[PDB]
Write a protein that binds this DNA or RNA. Sequence first.
RNA 1: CUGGAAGGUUAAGAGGAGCGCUUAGCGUAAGCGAAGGUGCGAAUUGAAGCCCCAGUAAACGGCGGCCGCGGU
Length: 52
Amino acid sequence: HPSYSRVHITAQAYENPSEPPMFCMLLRKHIEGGFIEKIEQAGLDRIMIFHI
RNA sequence: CUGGAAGGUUAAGAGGAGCGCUUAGCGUAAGCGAAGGUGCGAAUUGAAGCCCCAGUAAACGGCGGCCGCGGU
């Protein structure tokens, strides 16, 4: 989000759309079912890299 | 078009298992019936080709829809 960009584990409940967006379906196609091998930061920039 | 393995299909010719007609004989008749002649004739065998398989587009040819780069 332009103003509220963040990454964290959340307890909050979220309402999902009745139809999943294209990006969501793409992520599902490629990485749903997969395992997170590593999470790393690109130097000390605000960029997290998930190896899946 | 070129090449080709299995499997399938296919001519004449080859081959005659059988069958019909005829009748010496045999039978009171009805009918049976050798041999010969004669008229058909099944299995089996039978190439290329074709089906089939592979390649080949400066061979003949052909080079999409629909929906939201993705889906179908």
